[PDB]
C-alpha cells in the first residue's frame, strides 16, 4: 500500500504545516501537524476542556463505530517550545492520503496548553519520530508510520514541504518526479528516538564551504533552523545590522536587508536554503525589525533541522531495519 496527502502552511510565514487525516467511522477529518520530532498522535476532542478549545475541529469518539477506549492508558507530552498536552487514549481507524491503519492509538486531549488553544488551525499532532518516544502509559503505543510499515510497498515516508505553498507527505514510495538530481542518503542514530543525523558542514551565501560535523535532528514539527552558536554567528555577521536580541529571543535583522542563502552538507551533497526562506518577518506588526529563521541551538541541547531547512529539500525518512535519511534538491 501507499498513501499521499497534501500538507499546507497554516499561515503566511510557514510557521507550521497541516495535513488532513481521517479518523473513525464515519470519517472525522482533522487537520494535523505531522511532526518527525515526536511520536504521539493526539487530537483535540470532545473530552478537551471546553475553555481550551477555540476554533479547532474535534474528534468525538462516541460518534465513531470503530473507536474503543484503550482502558487505563494515559498520555502527557511536553515539547521543546514549552507547550504541552495530555489525556486518555482510544484506538480507531486512521487514514492518511488513502493509507489506512486499523487499531491506531488516537490520543484524546483532556488538556492543552495556551499555544495550542491559540492556534485554531491545528487540530492535533501526528508524530513520525521513533515509537520509543511515545508517551502513552502504561503500555507504550506505536506511531502511524510504525503501524503502517509492514503494509507499505517500501518502508519509507517522504516530506516535501513548500515555501509559502502546499507540499506533500508520501508513505510507502519515493516520487521520482518530485526532486531534481539524486537523493543522498546519510546515517541515522535512533538512540534518542529522533531522526538524528550528522551534517557535513555549511556555507553562508557565496562563501566557502566549512567542513565540520553537525549532529542534529530532522524535525518537521519545528519551524526554524537551530544550529551551534558559532555557525549562526557566522551567518548573521553577513547581514548588516543583524544582532541577537535577548528581549526578542534571538537574532533579528533590519527588514530592509537582503538575506544570504545558507548551505548545509549531506555527505558530499549540498542543500541550499534561499535567503528568502530565512525571513520570518516583523517581530511585531509594523516593526522594521525582522525575525531570523536561523537561530542558536545553545541551551536547547540539540541542533534542529526544522522546516526552514527541510522545505529546501525533498526528504526521505527511511524506516528500514537500518534507518537512514535522504536529501535531494527540488
Amino acid at each position: 500500500s501507499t498513501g499521499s496527502a497534501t500538507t499546507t502552511p497554516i499561515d503566511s510565514l510557514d510557521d507550521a504545516y497541516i495535513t488532513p487525516v481521517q479518523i473513525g467511522t464515519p470519517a472525522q477529518t482533522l487537520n494535523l501537524d505531522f511532526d518527525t520530532g515526536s511520536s504521539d498522535l493526539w487530537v483535540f476532542s470532545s473530552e478537551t476542556t471546553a475553555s481550551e478549545v477555540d476554533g479547532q475541529t474535534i474528534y468525538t469518539p462516541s460518534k465513531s463505530t470503530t473507536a474503543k477506549l484503550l482502558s487505563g492508558a494515559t498520555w502527557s507530552i511536553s515539547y521543546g517550545d514549552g507547550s504541552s498536552s495530555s489525556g486518555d487514549v482510544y484506538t480507531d481507524t486512521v487514514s492518511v492520503g488513502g493509507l489506512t491503519v486499523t487499531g491506531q492509538a488516537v490520543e484524546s486531549a483532556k488538556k492543552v496548553s495556551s499555544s495550542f488553544t491559540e492556534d485554531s488551525t491545528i487540530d492535533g499532532l501526528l508524530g513520525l519520530a521513533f515509537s520509543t518516544l511515545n508517551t502513552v502509559s502504561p503500555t507504550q503505543q506505536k506511531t502511524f508510520f510504525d503501524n503502517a510499515k509492514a503494509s507499505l510497498d517500501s518502508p519509507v515516508f517522504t516530506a516535501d514541504l513548500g515555501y509559502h505553498a502546499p507540499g506533500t507527505y508520501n508513505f510507502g514510495f519515493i516520487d521520482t518526479t518530485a526532486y531534481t538530481g539524486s537523493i543522498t542518503y546519510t546515517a541515522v542514530s535512533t538512540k534518542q528516538g529522533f531522526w538524528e543525523w550528522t551534517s557535513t558542514g555549511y556555507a553562508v551565501g557565496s562563501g566557502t564551504f566549512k567542513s565540520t560535523s553537525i549532529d542534529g535532528i530532522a524535525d518537521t514539527g519545528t519551524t526554524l533552523l537551530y544550529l551551534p552558536a558559532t555557525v549562526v554567528s557566522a551567518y548573521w555577521a553577513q547581514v548588516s545590522g543583524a544582532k541577537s536580541s535577548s528581549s526578542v529571543g534571538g537574532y533579528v535583522f533590519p527588514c530592509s536587508a537582503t538575506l544570504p542563502s545558507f548551505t548545509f552538507g549531506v555527505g558530499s551533497a549540498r542543500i541550499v536554503i534561499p535567503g528568502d526562506y530565512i525571513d520570518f518577518g516583523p517581530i511585531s506588526t509594523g516593526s522594521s525589525s525582522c525575525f531570523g529563521g536561523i537561530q542558536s541551538s545553545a541551551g536547547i541541547g540539540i541542533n534542529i533541522f526544522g522546516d526552514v531547512a527541510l522545505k529546501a529539500a525533498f526528504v526521505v525518512f527511511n524506516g528500514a531495519t537500518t534507518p537512514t535519511l535522504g536529501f535531494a534538491s527540488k
Side-chain angles (χ1 to χ4, degrees), residues 1-62 64-67 69-109 112-141 143-148 150-190 192-242 244-330:
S1 61
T2 61
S4 183
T6 298
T7 190
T8 303
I10 65 166
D11 62 25
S12 67
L13 299 181
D14 297 347
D15 280 318
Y17 299 77
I18 47 171
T19 309
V21 177
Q22 282 69 50
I23 309 174
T25 311
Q28 303 180 36
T29 299
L30 274 66
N31 296 329
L32 305 187
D33 185 351
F34 283 23
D35 181 14
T36 59
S38 68
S39 302
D40 286 50
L41 193 178
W42 74 259
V43 297
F44 278 79
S45 75
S46 58
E47 303 181 327
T48 311
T49 306
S51 68
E52 299 186 344
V53 185
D54 187 9
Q56 295 81 11
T57 295
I58 61 169
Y59 168 62
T60 303
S62 70
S64 174
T65 59
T66 45
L69 183 74
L70 186 61
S71 182
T74 59
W75 62 281
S76 178
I77 191 159
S78 297
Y79 298 97
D81 70 348
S83 67
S84 64
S85 52
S86 60
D88 54 18
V89 188
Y90 293 80
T91 54
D92 208 339
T93 303
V94 172
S95 300
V96 176
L99 172 70
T100 298
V101 168
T102 60
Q104 173 65 44
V106 178
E107 301 174 32
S108 171
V112 303
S113 61
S114 306
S115 168
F116 287 114
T117 300
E118 289 161 5
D119 192 352
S120 62
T121 71
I122 292 176
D123 301 325
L125 266 65
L126 190 149
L128 291 168
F130 293 91
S131 291
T132 50
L133 293 178
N134 176 267
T135 75
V136 178
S137 178
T139 310
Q140 190 171 57
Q141 300 293 307
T143 71
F144 175 81
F145 178 52
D146 219 328
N147 282 324
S151 302
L152 297 176
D153 288 1
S154 181
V156 302
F157 66 90
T158 65
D160 182 10
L161 304 178
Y163 170 65
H164 297 164
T168 307
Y169 283 101
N170 291 328
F171 292 84
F173 73 105
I174 288 160
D175 181 357
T176 59
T177 73
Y179 61 85
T180 60
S182 57
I183 306 175
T184 299
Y185 289 88
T186 195
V188 164
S189 173
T190 63
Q192 294 196 92
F194 301 116
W195 291 92
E196 187 171 4
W197 64 290
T198 303
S199 170
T200 48
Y202 72 100
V204 177
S206 55
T208 62
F209 187 84
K210 176 72 168 182
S211 295
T212 184
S213 293
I214 303 170
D215 294 341
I217 66 166
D219 185 3
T220 58
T222 291
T223 312
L224 305 187
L225 173 54
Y226 294 89
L227 293 173
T230 47
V231 178
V232 176
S233 187
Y235 177 81
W236 287 110
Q238 295 306 309
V239 179
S240 293
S244 180
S245 167
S246 58
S247 51
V248 176
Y251 281 94
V252 295
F253 67 93
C255 292
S256 59
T258 304
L259 297 176
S261 61
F262 184 89
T263 303
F264 63 96
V266 184
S268 58
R270 307 287 181 253
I271 300 296
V272 179
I273 307 171
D276 288 343
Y277 291 27
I278 301 165
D279 175 18
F280 276 75
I283 60 170
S284 293
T285 309
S287 179
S288 66
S289 176
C290 274
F291 196 70
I294 296 176
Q295 299 290 348
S296 179
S297 65
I300 294 178
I302 199 162
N303 300 305
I304 306 174
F305 293 85
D307 298 334
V308 163
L310 303 179
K311 71 197 192 183
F314 177 86
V315 188
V316 181
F317 295 77
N318 173 26
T321 309
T322 297
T324 66
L325 274 174
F327 292 82
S329 295
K330 64 184 181 186

